Amino acid sequence: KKYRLLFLSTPVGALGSGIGGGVELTLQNAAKALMAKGHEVEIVAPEGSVTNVTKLTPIAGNSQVSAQTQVGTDMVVLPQDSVLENMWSYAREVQDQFDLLFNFAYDWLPLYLTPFFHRPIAHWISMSSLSPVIDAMVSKTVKLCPQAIAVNTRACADTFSDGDRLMIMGKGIDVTQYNFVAKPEKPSLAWVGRISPEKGLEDAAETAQATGLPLRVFGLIQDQAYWQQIQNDFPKAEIHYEGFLSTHELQQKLGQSSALLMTPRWIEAFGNAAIEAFACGVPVISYRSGGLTEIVRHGKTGFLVDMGSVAGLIEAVSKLETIDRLACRQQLEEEYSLEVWGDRLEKWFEQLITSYT
Template sequence: MVTQSEKRLKILLISTSVGPLGSGIGGGVELTLHNIAKTLTQRNHEIRIVAPGGSVCGSFPVVEISGELQFTAQGEGRDALIALPKNSVLANMWDYARQVQDRYDVLVNFAYDWLPFYLTPFFPCPIAHLVSMGSLTDAMDQIIGQMAAQFPGTIGVHSRTQAETFSFADHCRVIGNGFDLSLYQFCPEPENVLGWVGRIAPEKGLEDAVAVAQETGIPLKIWGILQEVAYWHDICDQFPDAPVSYEGFLPTAELQHALGKCRALLMTPRWVEAFGNVVIESLACGVPVIAYRRGGPAEIIQDGKTGWLVEPDHIAGLVTAIAQLDQIDRHTCRQQVELDYSLEALGDRLEQWFGELLAGRELVIGGRW
């Protein structure tokens, strides 16, 4: 393992290209990048972030790159073609990385896009790819699989469930995630409200949570970026009497304060969530999570201890789980994340990953990756 006492690494973090950091468009990738920057900085590594223009990532240095934003990968279908807009910010970010790569020990790619994987063989500096989603398109599967085979150990994922959506699952390294738990206040006494957090888009399955609110009469508070307005309006038309309120997109400090007051968080995704950052954020506040037994959340939630896992797309199961919330000890929820999902635990896994990548690079003849 590389430790700060052994070597201070210089690391370039190259952000998602679908939106500026701080906008919420990048979903959980934004929080993940921030937390990785924080734990690496605490360990005395030197980091710099490359991101689309208008990005803000706390107090960390950000090189803002102009250009047209990349399309999001969700919902495009298995046969989706690879496309770049004119003056692509993705291409511009990686051109910048090419020019400065000799200043860094490792580059970390956060973009679920074809171009960074394709460029990997052309970069002398090693690239660690942190893949944020499961299998979505044939083209992405192919290029990630090629890099997994050609450059062993370079593909990181957040959960084993996510990895298993790929045919090359055994070549993926599970990194998980980690959080600054000092930012999340434990709330022992909730209000009689439920919460839902995420991008408001079809793959997130918000309509199921709204259906639960209508059936139980328990108010549902919704937080997240309103990505697809027509989808939101359809839900409102479908459930006109549901006791729901849209609370907007909130930064961590405000979100954890509001989320902590909920009796439970509902997670109702239609797709395989790679991890589920909001599960950890919820548990850190002492809020149990009721989620479909699908994707990363199913690896995090301890059924019957820190929440309930329900068969996918089964609204009646969600309602039944809500009736059993009194069986969950909110202190146990907080204890789980303190044990498994701290920044310290994440930092250990990252240092081991980078250390092994650099050790492997030194074995390559001629010192070339």
């Protein structure tokens, strides 16, 4: 069962620019996983895209607005000569050379064009129902082509009107790129996410202050005024900025943490910090929110805390010694690895190719 697959990337930025976000990594990890099972993969992506994973054919056009800015929109907006148009124009040109098409863009046009191709198209929805057109199109598309749309977490399907017809594929990461730290040199706590007042970073600082453990922050300081506030509100806490880093620079410093604190104030979707902390042998102490409750195995690879309970975070930090760091790594090897994930995608596509036939 050696398939020929065409991967269609996001139109927001170019591969390697980091502008598209986690999908840029999910795409290449999907390519790596499916290639290692013996399949051929071609990546279609905008002009200026670069990858070392497989063949990439760039496509000229105008970059499309990100779908994270239009939350709840019932609009479809495509710029003149949009990249997404020419990408799917190309897909129609070459679709006969392939067995399946795999889409990563979170947009209307790829979903709508699905019944217009004479090859099966698969869709990876990267975020959880941010807009009803995608909810409507996902609704329309799964009814027209069952098993057509997959996501990572059940929490994501909960935001979709037809999540019961959404496929749950989890995710996969490249374990060889993460430095497992068996034991950090000094105890410390870590936090990863967007630095803004409604991301719960304040709770982590208090936990750091009450336990006497330095807090190491990873992310983009979007409000330099807001950053200054946190050190002032939790004064005796040793808070350190580690910058907005790539996957490599992040894990190079993540392993030296005793635990990753994930303290959302609302249902949070900037995970993978957990999955990567498991790659580095870092247990995860997180509030009970969204997909984390399915990743953090309480008492085994971390702790789950009642939402908003700073006292719960402090108690959990005090019990870190009971968490075998090897267990975190072992969970990542058995789930969230390219070997197991590449198996699920492979089984998923073969169902689609045979059912489409």
